[PDB]
Amino acid sequence: EEEFENTRKNHQRALDSMQASLEAEAKGKAEALRMKKKLEADINELEI
Amino acid sequence: EEEFENTRKNHQRALDSMQASLEAEAKGKAEALRMKKKLEADINELEI
């Protein structure tokens, strides 16, 4: 079991690492859907 | 081991619960950047 508490601590690292990978992707959708509504105004702005 | 066997069975579904979201946030970015180009297709076309 002393080997196993290394294995617990092995993937407990792997859990919050993938959480940070989502944190990049949560940041990834964030400005993208944000800068859409900035540019979607602009493509309506040039039309007028 | 049977104490630690179910903990693996817990954590395997936990990583599965995160991997479902990374399946979502990838395709949501694919929903974004694909729609970004058609937005970027207009801003070149309207300014031309």
Side-chain angles (χ1 to χ4, degrees):
Chain A
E1 59 88 13
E2 289 160 89
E3 272 112 4
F4 256 55
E5 44 177 20
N6 205 357
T7 69
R8 163 185 280 108
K9 285 303 161 281
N10 218 7
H11 66 73
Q12 214 274 344
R13 173 204 302 113
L15 173 68
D16 72 342
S17 64
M18 298 295 113
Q19 162 68 28
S21 74
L22 186 146
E23 185 271 353
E25 296 319 282
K27 175 49 61 174
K29 192 179 277 222
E31 84 277 64
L33 260 187
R34 166 168 314 273
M35 81 103 67
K36 169 175 182 296
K37 295 319 295 174
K38 191 253 182 181
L39 267 70
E40 178 273 348
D42 199 288
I43 64 151
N44 214 356
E45 199 269 348
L46 257 56
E47 208 285 332
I48 203 154
Chain B
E1 63 201 291
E2 272 265 10
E3 305 168 279
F4 276 143
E5 176 272 350
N6 60 85
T7 58
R8 173 180 295 111
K9 192 65 60 57
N10 210 7
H11 152 252
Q12 175 74 39
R13 295 313 194 95
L15 188 145
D16 198 341
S17 74
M18 280 316 95
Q19 273 313 295
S21 288
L22 203 46
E23 163 58 22
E25 305 316 281
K27 289 305 288 174
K29 177 181 281 294
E31 194 272 352
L33 271 184
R34 202 205 323 279
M35 252 296 298
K36 183 65 43 183
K37 276 300 160 180
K38 295 298 294 314
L39 284 195
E40 292 155 305
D42 188 49
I43 192 65
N44 209 32
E45 177 272 348
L46 279 197
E47 84 197 321
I48 212 64

